[PDB]
Amino acid sequence: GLVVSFYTPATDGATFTAIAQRCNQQFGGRFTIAQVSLPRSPNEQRLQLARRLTGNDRTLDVMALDVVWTAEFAEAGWALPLSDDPAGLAENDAVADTLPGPLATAGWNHKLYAAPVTTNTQLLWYRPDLVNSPPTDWNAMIAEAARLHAAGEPSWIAVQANQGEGLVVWFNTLLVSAGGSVLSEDGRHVTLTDTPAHRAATVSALQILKSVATTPGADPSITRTEEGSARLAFEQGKAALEVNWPFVFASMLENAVKGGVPFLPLNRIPQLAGSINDIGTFTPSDEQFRIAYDASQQVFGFAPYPAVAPGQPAKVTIGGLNLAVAKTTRHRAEAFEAVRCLRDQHNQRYVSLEGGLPAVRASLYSDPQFQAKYPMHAIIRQQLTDAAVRPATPVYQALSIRLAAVLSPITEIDPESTADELAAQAQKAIDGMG
């Protein structure tokens, strides 16, 4: 039969490949889903997809889009509205049993242009052996890092924030948690410094970035043009504190069974031998998962994202992937059917438990079988319930590029002047000038 192309980020290739294979057994010769990988950064995923769309690549069918691209891909007509499904089933499937935050990321001008498949929110990860209590706010984070430095322990605070979208996500979380916002609701005005309260929020966020940057024992990966991994920095024992997406859970066990984690020698447990499947994925039995998790809990713990204002949780920036159908497709019906199968219950369980990507199906967070294998479900769902959002605007690419260029390196942030520079660059971005 025909082939529905399914473009996903390369680091999520295998996972989605597996999901496609499952769905391929359910169509039975009618058509086949073929996964194709896109580069690692959201900007490059966007660039590849945009080149194929403006180039009228008629072989491009289904796209796994970062939540930040919806607006653009809706305004350009690149992502077909879900109401363009010839079967008329896409919208109802997308809203059914799906968390409202992801759905909000999938909409534009009161219409859905994608069906959420994965969502994302950052947690705090710590070494319970070296850190007696997980810090609840960012000043506590700085104090704990300084204490670990004074104790000769790893004092890095591992944040996946080099000079790109990760840094913008960190800033957005800090800013919204402080009561601020990059843009107005309609995305037409810059709200970083337009009122005293807004400017105060921006200044507090920049101050937190600067103080984390210059904390005793700070990571030297920020003062360089690096592609460093906070996940691997934690897994190598260089950091006892990390804020990152939940996939680092699935990584930690997996890499520990492969022998790649020094302080967690899961590879030396005979009962875990063979728990790595033939394509390199940690697929434990129930008892093997119990063994691995109970061993990991003495050196690996999770906690809510640190608050900005002590006394209430943070507003954590939402991320994830929404499934959209490209306007270039020759088979709208099969593309939307594939979208529906790719996000069904079984594949959501798989994408969360094996792929490390938070599911969007609300039912799963109320499923005890799922909860027993995904111990972070409660914190994830609560952080998704009151999540921060990045601005939804068709010029988000230029906006994020300009904001990242100003923010980095965070060692050079001067809160007041940097706030003014951020507002000016954001204005340039939204003026059709970025």
Ligand SMILES: CC(=O)NC[C@H]1O[C@H](O[C@H]2O[C@H](CO)[C@@H](O)[C@H](O)[C@H]2O)[C@H](O)[C@@H](O)[C@@H]1O
């Ligand atoms: C480094 C960073 O944080 N960039 C911002 C994007 O982070 C998330 O996406 C990345 O991480 C996911 C794993 O958790 C992975 O599936 C994606 O392929 C990565 O691009 C987040 O989901 C995105 O919305 C952020 O834009």
